[PDB]
């Protein structure tokens, strides 16, 4: 925040000054600006991509076991989940997708390399 | 029309066949009768024997870009499934 506690009148606040005894937090209204310029240089955060990307994280297969096992584990969680169908969340048809859907993509991106 | 089938059948059945047997199969009398066909068929032939070194047409242009595109299809399929992810709207 920024305080400067008093006004001219106001956006013109007015009374307590002439009535004296102005005290408060009294913020000002902040903003700021930069540019699209540094924005790039900022978003430059994250040779490069080719070196940085595909190919740089094509490492998967190292984990295929997990990548399996991760996917493997999904299975169990669900027979469980579905079962409760027989209330509120944990619901029989919820984490199912969010679970078997997280290992679906991450497992397709690797195909790009091969 | 009969034998062309048999020709393929021999083709299928036989990589190699005696130019006799094929003729015998063709019911031909001259094998040059046969020989024409087989070579019309463009069959590898040495002495006395019709051969099939390639019994089939493999490769030959079209039927491509799909059904054996490795990632491409897969990527298309990705792209597709990604559209199953994208058209998901």
From Swiss-Prot, chain A:
Q: How is it modified after translation?
A: N-acetylated by NAT3.
What is a single cellular component term in the Gene Ontology annotation? proteasome storage granule
Keyword annotations from UniProtKB, A to Z: Acetylation, Hydrolase, Metal-binding, Metalloprotease, Protease, Proteasome, Thiol protease, Ubl conjugation pathway, Zinc
Provide a GO biological process annotation. protein deubiquitination
The keyword Phosphoprotein is assigned to this record: no
Domain of life from the UniProt record: Eukaryota
Task: Supply one GO molecular-function term.
Answer: metal ion binding
What does this protein do, in the record's words?
Answer: Component of the lid subcomplex of the 26S proteasome, a multiprotein complex involved in the ATP-dependent degradation of ubiquitinated proteins. RPN11 is the only catalytically active member of the lid and serves as the essential deubiquitinase of the proteasome.
- Quote the subunit structure annotation: Component of the lid subcomplex of the 19S proteasome regulatory particle complex (also named PA700 complex). The 26S proteasome consists of a 20S proteasome core and two 19S regulatory subunits. Interacts directly with RPN8 and STS1.
Q: What is known of its domains?
A: The JAMM motif is required for the deubiquitination and degradation of ubiquitinated substrates.
Task: Fill in the misc note.
Answer: Present with 16400 molecules/cell in log phase SD medium.
- Family stated for the protein in its record: Belongs to the peptidase M67A family.
Instruction: Kindly provide the name given to this protein in its UniProt entry.
Output: Ubiquitin carboxyl-terminal hydrolase RPN11
What are the top taxonomic ranks of the organism?
Eukaryota, Fungi, Dikarya, Ascomycota, Saccharomycotina
In the complete protein, the residues contained here run 154 to 298 of 306
Swiss-Prot record, chain B:
Protein purpose: Acts as a regulatory subunit of the 26S proteasome which is involved in the ATP-dependent degradation of ubiquitinated proteins. Necessary for activation of the CDC28 kinase.
In its miscellaneous comment, the UniProt entry states:
Present with 9890 molecules/cell in log phase SD medium.
Instruction: Name the family the entry cites.
Output: Belongs to the proteasome subunit S14 family.
This one is known as 26S proteasome regulatory subunit RPN12
User: Species name for this entry?
Assistant: Saccharomyces cerevisiae (strain ATCC 204508 / S288c)
Query: Which part of the entire protein is covered?
Result: 184 to 272 of 274
